[PDB]
């Protein structure tokens, strides 16, 4: 129930991995989705993969 401008995130480089599977880093702003879910945690470097 909101508008999200993902171009703010992808074009800010306060990020390391934009590992998007099923979508391209630049296309999220163009598409509409039913409901989005967010999860968060802190991990180590080599385990990111």
């Amino acid at each position: 129930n909101c508008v999200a401008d993902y171009s703010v995130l992808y074009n800010s480089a306060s990020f390391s991995t934009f590992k998007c599977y099923g979508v391209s880093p630049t296309k999220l702003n163009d598409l509409c989705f039913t409901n989005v879910y967010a999860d968060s945690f802190v991990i180590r470097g080599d385990e990111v993969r």
Partner: nanobody
Amino acid sequence: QVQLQESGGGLVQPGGSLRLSCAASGFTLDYYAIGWFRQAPGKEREGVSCISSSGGRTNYADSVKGRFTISRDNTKNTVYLQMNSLKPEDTAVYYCAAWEASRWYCPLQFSADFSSWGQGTQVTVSS
């Protein structure tokens, strides 16, 4: 499969020269802006120099201003850091990293987060 490899380091005499080659496999390095980084033993990671994805914008550090030169070969998927008039202060392991534009404006003199960190090569200057 996104790999960055640092090739071209070694032990050099002060006042000499050396060339570094950053190799990318599994992805297109042309779409990524590259910036070299150094972390000497006992020193924090300070920015060497940054070059944009198109190569038309270049960043440099005042500690190596006029001595370190950056060029990229997007056709060969490689970015080169040419070093001249070396000093013992440059004895550090060197990493090349890829990341996108962090803000408006073309130059990338402002540091930001870096995605792909390579294995790194240690370049030693001592004589």
